[PDB]
Design a protein around this ligand. Structure first.
Ligand code: NAG
Length: 246
C-alpha cells in the first residue's frame, strides 16, 4: 500500500505520495542511475494497491502492475472494475477478490481506447489535484463514459508522474487549479517505452541511443534525444520499463 489524501493535499504531500509510489516498485538494478523495473513478478506480488481518498474522505483502491506501472483495475465500495484486456483479467485473479461484484469495463487501458471511450483526447482534459479528486469521485459511481475520462486523469496524475519528474512537477503546479497537460507532458508519456528501451541499449553503446527519441520541449519545440547526457535522462525519467517487456 501507498496512500494519498486529497483533503489538505498540497505540492509537498503529493510529492511524498509520488515518492512512495516510486519506492514501492521493486528493482534489482539501476541503468544510468535509474531504477530498472523487473522483467516479471509471479503471483500477487505483481500488483501494488494505491489507496486514494477524495476530499470528503471516500476511497478507491487502485491496482498497479509493478513491472510497468499500468493501472489494471480498481475497487470502489464493494465493486471491483478491471479493464477489458488479458493482463487485467489475470490481475483480477489476485486483487479485490473480496469484492461483491466484478465489472469489466468496456475498453482496454491504453490511451487510444480510453480517449475513444471518453469522447476526447487527453490534450483537452484538464489535470491536476482538483481533477484527481474529481476522478476519484467519478469512479465511485459506475458510468463507463465518465470513468474513461476519470481514468485518463488518474493514470497521468499517478503513473505518469511516477515515471517522469517533469510530470510530477506539472501536477504540483496544478495543485489548486487544473490545466490541460503541456505538449511536452504528452510527448513524455508517449515516449516512455522508447526512452526506457534506448537508455537500456545505450549500455554497451557508450551512452548513445541506437535510435533517437523525438520529444517536444517545454517551449513547444521538437527535439531529438540521442544519448544519456540529455536532461531527460539525467534529471527527468525515474523508472525504466524493462526491454524484456518491449
Ligand atoms: C549528445 O547530446 C548532447 C545533448 O546532451 C549534444 O550536445 C551532444 O552533441 C551529443 N553527444 C554525443 C556524444 O552524441
Amino acid at each position: 500500500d501507498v496512500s494519498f489524501r486529497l483533503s489538505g493535499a498540497d505540492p509537498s504531500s503529493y510529492g511524498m505520495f509520488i515518492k512512495d509510489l516510486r519506492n514501492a516498485l521493486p528493482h534489482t538494478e539501476k541503468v544510468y542511475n535509474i531504477p530498472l523495473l523487473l522483467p516479471s513478478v509471479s503471483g500477487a506480488g505483481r500488483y501494488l494497491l494505491m489507496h486514494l481518498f477524495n476530499y470528503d474522505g471516500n476511497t478507491i483502491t487502485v491496482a498497479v502492475d509493478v513491472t510497468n506501472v499500468y493501472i489494471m483495475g480498481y475497487l470502489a465500495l464493494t465493486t471491483s472494475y478491471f479493464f477489458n484486456e488479458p493482463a487485467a483479467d489475470l490481475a483480477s485473479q489476485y486483487v479485490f477478490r473480496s469484492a461483491r461484484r466484478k465489472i469489466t469495463l468496456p475498453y482496454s487501458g491504453n490511451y487510444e481506447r480510453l480517449q475513444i471511450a471518453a469522447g476526447k483526447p487527453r490534450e483537452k482534459i484538464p489535470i491536476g489535484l482538483p481533477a484527481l479528486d474529481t476522478a476519484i469521485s467519478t469512479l465511485l459511481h459506475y458510468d463507463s463514459t465518465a470513468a474513461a475520462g476519470a481514468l485518463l486523469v488518474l493514470i497521468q496524475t499517478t503513473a505518469e508522474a511516477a515515471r517522469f519528474k517533469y510530470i510530477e512537477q506539472q501536477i504540483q503546479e496544478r495543485a489548486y487549479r487544473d490545466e490541460v497537460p503541456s505538449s511536452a507532458t504528452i510527448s513524455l508519456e508517449n515516449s516512455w517505452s522508447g526512452l526506457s528501451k534506448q537508455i537500456q541499449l545505450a549500455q554497451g553503446n557508450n551512452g548513445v541511443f541506437r535510435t533517437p527519441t523525438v520529444l517536444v520541449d517545454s517551449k513547444g519545440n521538437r527535439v531529438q534525444i540521442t544519448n544519456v547526457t540529455s536532461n531527460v535522462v539525467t534529471s527527468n525519467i525515474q523508472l525504466l520499463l524493462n526491454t524484456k517487456n518491449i
